[PDB]
Amino acid sequence: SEVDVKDCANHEIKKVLVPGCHGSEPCIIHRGKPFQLEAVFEANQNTKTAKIEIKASIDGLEVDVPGIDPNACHYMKCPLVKGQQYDIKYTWNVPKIAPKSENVVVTVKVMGDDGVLACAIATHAKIRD
Amino acid sequence: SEVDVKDCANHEIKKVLVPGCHGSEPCIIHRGKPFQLEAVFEANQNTKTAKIEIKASIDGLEVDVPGIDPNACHYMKCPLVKGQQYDIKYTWNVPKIAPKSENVVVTVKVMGDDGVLACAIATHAKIRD
């Protein structure tokens, strides 16, 4: 369930797992259903904070992503230790009303005390149902 | 299966389901794990709105509940029509850092355009792990 994502920092993200998706094949996101993911990254800094920013665009238009807790330290053992690897598991609820699209770009950026912790761009999600 | 809840509105909620939980038996919420829930209710009003408020109390102290999308219309087809029954499914991510407790009270109120859509109090959840 390892999926291909584009790193946009310095390869801190080691592996992104989405059950039911793989590699660079179209990863189908079904409206109204849970979407599970798991990510393993290495901390590039000692940091008390880990804050998530998500940007999604559907056919080139930016859309709000509801239901995300911005504080990643709620789901991990902060503070983070430089050189250690952390695992985060999260289930996102796909809105029943999300616009269908075959051209989806998701950018997630994680900020710590001393700058970006992790950055990934995912281009293979498709929203259907 | 079906779990037991106290209604605090006018019996609009028909059934609450949590997998692995039964009636009034201790329903165990695990730290750092997904908590799945399903509910069917009957709309008592025509409404384009349906906004959720949660309050949680742990051993008699209120604690903030993160990771909740207050717009319930994201997970249903609003507007709602009076007299129709709706089903909502939602997976909540239990914070890794949630205080452990055997005395947990959860109160969920749903508010529509012209008044309370639904209200339930749940007293059998325990936070462990």
Curated annotation (Swiss-Prot), chains A, B:
Q: Name the source's superkingdom.
A: Eukaryota
Q: Which CDD domains did the record assign?
A: Der-p2_like
The cysteines covalently paired via disulfide bonds are 8-119, 21-27, 73-78
Tell me which Gene Ontology terms the entry assigns under biological process. sterol transport
Name this polypeptide is given: Mite group 2 allergen Der p 2
Q: Name the Gene Ontology molecular function terms of this record.
A: sterol binding
Q: Where in the cell is it found?
A: Secreted
Q: Which gene encodes it?
A: DERP2
Query: Which keywords annotate this record?
Result: Allergen, Disulfide bond, Secreted, Signal
Organism in which the protein naturally occurs:
Dermatophagoides pteronyssinus (European house dust mite)
